[PDB]
Amino acid sequence: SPIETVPVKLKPGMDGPKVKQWPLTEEKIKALVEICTEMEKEGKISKIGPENPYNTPVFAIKKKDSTKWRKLVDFRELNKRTQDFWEVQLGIPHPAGLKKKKSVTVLDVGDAYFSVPLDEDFRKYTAFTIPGIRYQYNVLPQGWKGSPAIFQSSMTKILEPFKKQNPDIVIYQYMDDLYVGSDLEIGQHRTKIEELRQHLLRWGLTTPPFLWMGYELHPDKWTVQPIVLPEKDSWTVNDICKLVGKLNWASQIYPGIKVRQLSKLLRGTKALTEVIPTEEAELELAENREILKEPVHGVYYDPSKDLIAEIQKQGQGQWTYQIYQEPFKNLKTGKYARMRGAHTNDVKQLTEAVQKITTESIVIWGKTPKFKLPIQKETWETWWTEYWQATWIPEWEFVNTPPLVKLWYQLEKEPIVGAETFYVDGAANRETKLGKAGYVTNKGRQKVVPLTNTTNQKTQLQAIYLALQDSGLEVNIVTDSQYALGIIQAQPDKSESELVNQIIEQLIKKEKVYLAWVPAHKGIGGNEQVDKLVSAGIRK
Amino acid sequence: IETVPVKLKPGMDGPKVKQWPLTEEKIKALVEICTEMEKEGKISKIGPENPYNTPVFAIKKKDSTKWRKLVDFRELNKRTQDFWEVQLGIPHPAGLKKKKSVTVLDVGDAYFSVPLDEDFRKYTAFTIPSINNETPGIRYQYNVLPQGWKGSPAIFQSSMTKILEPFKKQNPDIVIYQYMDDLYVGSDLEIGQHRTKIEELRQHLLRWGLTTPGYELHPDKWTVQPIVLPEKDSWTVNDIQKLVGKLNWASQIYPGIKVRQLSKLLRGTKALTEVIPLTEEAELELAENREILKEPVHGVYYDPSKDLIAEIQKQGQGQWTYQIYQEPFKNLKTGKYARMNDVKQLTEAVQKITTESIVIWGKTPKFKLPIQKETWETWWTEYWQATWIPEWEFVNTPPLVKLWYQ
RNA sequence: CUAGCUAGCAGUGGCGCCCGAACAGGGACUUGA
Secondary structure, eight states: OOOOOOOOOOOTTOOOOOOOOOOOOSTTHHHHHHHHHHHHHHTSEEOOOSSOOOOOOEEEEOOSSOSOOEEEEOOTTHHHHSOOOOOOOOOOOOGGGOOOOSEEEOOBOTTGGGGSBOOTTGGGGOEEEEOOEEEEEOBOOTTOTTHHHHHHHHHHHHHHHHHHHOTTSEEEEOSSBEEEEESOOHHHHHHHHHHHHHHHHTTOOOOOOEEETTEEEOSSOEEEOOOOOOOOSOOOHHHHHHHHHHHHHHHTTSTTOOOHHHHHHSSSOOOSSOOOOOHHHHHHHHHHHHHHTSOOEEOOOOSSSOOEEEEEEEETTEEEEEEEEETTEEEEEOOBOOOOSSEEOHHHHHHHHHHHHHHHHHHHTSSOOEEEESSOHHHHHHHHHTSSSOOOOOSEEEOOOSSOOOOSOOOOSSOOTTOOOOBOBOOOOTTTOOOEEBOOOSSOOOOOEEOSSOOHHHHHHHHHHHHHHSOOSEEEEEESOHHHHHHHHHOOSEESSHHHHHHHHHHHTSSEEEEEEOOSSSOOTTHHHHHHHHOTTTOO | OOOOOOOOOTTOOOOBOOOOOOOHHHHHHHHHHHHHHHHTTSEEOOOTTOOOBBOEEEOOOTTSSOOOEEEOOHHHHHHHHHIIIIISOOOOOSSGGGSSBEEEEEOHHHHTTSBOOGGGGGGSOBEEOOGGGOSOOEEOEEOBOOSSOTHHHHHHHHHHHHHHHHHHSSOTTOEEEOSSSEEEEEBOSOHHHHHHHHHHHHHHHHTTOOOOOOOEEOSTTOOOOOOOOOOOSOOBHHHHHHHHHHHHHHTTTSSSOOOTTHHHHTTSOOOSSSBOOOOHHHHHHHHHHHHHHSSOOTTOOOOSSSOOEEEEEEOSTTOEEEEEEEETTEEEEEEEEOOOOOHHHHHHHHHHHHHHHHHHTOOOOEEEBSSOHHHHHHHTTSSOOOSSOOOOOBOOOOTTGGGTOO
């Protein structure tokens, strides 16, 4: 193994932590002895422990497929004192973000952790003893904190010459799998595979739809593994964890699959025999069946041709997106329904959706796709020109399909002749929570109504609500609290607080409306008047 | 070469912030430049032996089609400030903001010719991303002085002045200021004379192999624009309401402002569209407020120790306003920016703002942009044409600043 | 160090407890109208 090693260091002001090997039983020694002699005669573990004052814990267990007992080494105290190392692995790939490889194959190298050496200076921290006799690791040991990082670094450093010799071979490396493919003939494909096998054997490496972490990769397409669901009544805690994992791994690709019914029905359950009781769970699982009755099939990304995106609203602040390159040949689908912010509306959610989609396209495909938005050009330009923030989207076009994305109402910047003045205000004590709300008019048609368990903001909201309730066709309203100003000027359609929702539902039927703002407690028109009218026994 | 020993500060480690994704078209230029920079010995590949990581992105520089790479050293600079701040720093002259012309220059090629300390290279490790996370990150490590970390000019200024002395002696009126990799020149001559002098300086810098191809700014056109009020014969109730609101807000800025006479005309509860006769007393107070407004707000100094804050807002149709202040309501400099896509204009505005603050005071001010975090974080690499990264955040604006201007 | 004198691994994915880090809502301190 003439491969170059990696310089390894230790945390400053630290050293090898000693361990007091627990005296174990006897029905686990002979196997340990035979296995350490077997690993010693291979030349990857040395036994030089004459004066080394260090020790590491040793364990043994018989796992599934019981044929023999194997050794186990732990570093619960060694990895803690070991300096931190960079972790290159930070995400997961996507099946749709692949290419079209006619001659595709897979390859994995098992037990390759022994085929990589370790720094001789760092080998001082591999005190592996057993009742005595001590051994020292000479290769990368299992369970090491920096084992996968060093392994993948060595893998890349050893396959880079093969990439230099043949840059026209698409290679998708991983922890141990080597997803290699190209567009060559079967003979040329086998020749390249044999050349790669010889290249790995140069350093002594074992060279022996598809499966990719549960995915299905066909030569001409790709799809998700068809999941199933048991049809029993009881569900143990193991069954619970398993089914919730299945539905979580299925909801990431399929739409309309949620976990609110199982989350709400599986609260506080820490037992194993607990038989959770309902019709809601039954209908949710039947919908999951119906959706999983027909499997979806994606298409590999084509680098030559571009790709188009589109989004269609489904109702109740839920929006689904599609990514495609050819008509009806969609790559992947999904859903976006997060209520970002207290007050949201149509174009704000559309901007959030398009930014999420372009971020996904950057992280998956590394480019920006064209968008087919179901909205008009002049509406969007008026919106972003008449907004107090900065919102920009890439090039797009219009598609005629319900439901259309429009604005339920608009606003003005100057009063209208024939309107009526409306000075509104209202507050309550910080302990009684019993406040009122009124207003004034030219003709003198005021109206005060008390409230119960309300805050000043909600008092002003109720005041403007009752103002717009008995108003004419075109009225103007002036207030003082900038909170209602910011709420109304944003022009929402769906908010968390239903109060503003009923307010906008009452205002939308009105043709025109104008808003203003005046500093309170300055005697401006009817502000101080309504303040004195509503402050009866709440001011002093 | 004897590299100056540079160290970090105890208690804080190096930067370990993640790297946002990029586009494959940018990855092409990234590979095509890092291969050359590694063949030139400026960088070298490393492994996972160092957990420190700093993001890297690329821009499309003007005057050519190259893709100059840059590293956001915000964390490194924020953690090593004290070194270049008290150990070896450079003061800020005041004569450059009174000249006629100024030309921006880059001297990164000079930084690319000096080795860096070996014990410090483990903190400037930069990594490039990969598409679909298939190929692991191709890590690298700097071997020369990088661009973005303000310690490299702090340690290079010696040789910089040593090289610029032979030609700056015959030109006593010239000014040289290098807060970062950028380079500004102070000249109060005509456009032709400034052109000749700047091409002479280009020759002087290329004498040592410096490939150097907004560009020419003017500091004399920077006047303080205070709050302006409308003056029309028609005075509706809405107009006087907006006026009293604006002046009640500005009372924190202008102390000697009252609402005595203005609060009398609007006392009668009436409608809004009607016109009210403006009395001479309210007219006198309005004229007083007008003549006080044009006077610059006194008492606003410049603290060379505290930080800077430069808020920016958007009015519409490109009407970008901006205010700079070290303390709330203690504005130091205002202005306007309009008549230049929705993010390109914002990037140009923040670029102009930070350039003016650098050539005036010499300190990158913190920004408050009125934009969502994810959108700008993903689209700020489109039209960015600078070489360093400033500090910023994401805060909304109240519904009052929209009435600060027309 | 943990679990009932005795037994006591790690990584990957998942659903479950506590704390910290970001967004949104209620009280105290300070400064002015």
